[PDB]
Assembly symmetry: D2
Homo-oligomer: 84 residues x 4
């Protein structure tokens, strides 16, 4: 089974949009290397992204929201270390 | 555990777009009743949607792709039978 | 100038999602042949699509909402008659 | 006519996704105050956003891509100065 990505986003905060945008950014560049990307509704300003359980991004810790390039780089390092 | 929706789409067919559109259609109308909606890359003209493992749509069987309303109705019937 | 596509959608009806989905479907298959695709907030059950002013789709007339292939075919015929 | 937003994006760069994402971010928070948001295919690393002709963002000048909040703030200042 291929790596699973989970994007937990605050629904009341209207973060579905950016969450689905990032999911598509990932699914289009790692179409072959990803098992599936899940969007998980959450609450309280939550915005976290995990790869096979390992946190790859969290709003507070990383200070905001990821640029597509930065997020792809972090997923690349965990899924396919060597990949330009 | 809230109901999990899985959308398996053909990547080579360029169906990511419509798959992410339907995922957002679902997440915005069932934000509180859905555990998570997953997009799962597949192949060979596949386009299937499951709710807690139960098939709610399949390209061939249902003849094409779902209208948002139709898909929401099928998910409603399984997740919240009584809901206008 | 290149052909301009306008998608007028009912905002209260929550049709922004499907409107943006169709806009992307069009911009990704006709990237070189389209001047620009516009999303225009409308009211009251409105869902109309025009190509250089010529109606290419409306809800009542066409009975619902377009499948991607159908809409692309209609834009094809007006923008590049001969094209698969 | 209401303010028109134009998002010029580099097609070869695969920036349609992020362009459509920002368009939706804008259309959902300014549904009533915007005439229409247009996505305009471009080239050569372009990423520009204008409001009634006035540049509200440009990749090089502003150094990268806008956060939804930042972009909404800039459109707010030009379209409805006083608004939270």
């Amino acid at each position: 089974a291929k790596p699973e990505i989970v994007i937990t986003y605050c629904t009341q905060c209207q973060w579905l949009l950016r969450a689905a945008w990032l999911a598509q950014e990932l699914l289009s560049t790692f179409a072959d290397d990803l098992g599936k990307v899940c969007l998980e509704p959450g609450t309280g300003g939550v915005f976290r992204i995990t790869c096979d359980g390992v946190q790859v991004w969290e709003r507070k810790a990383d200070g905001g929201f990821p640029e597509a390039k930065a997020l792809k780089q972090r997923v690349r390092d965990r899924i396919d270390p060597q990949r330009d």
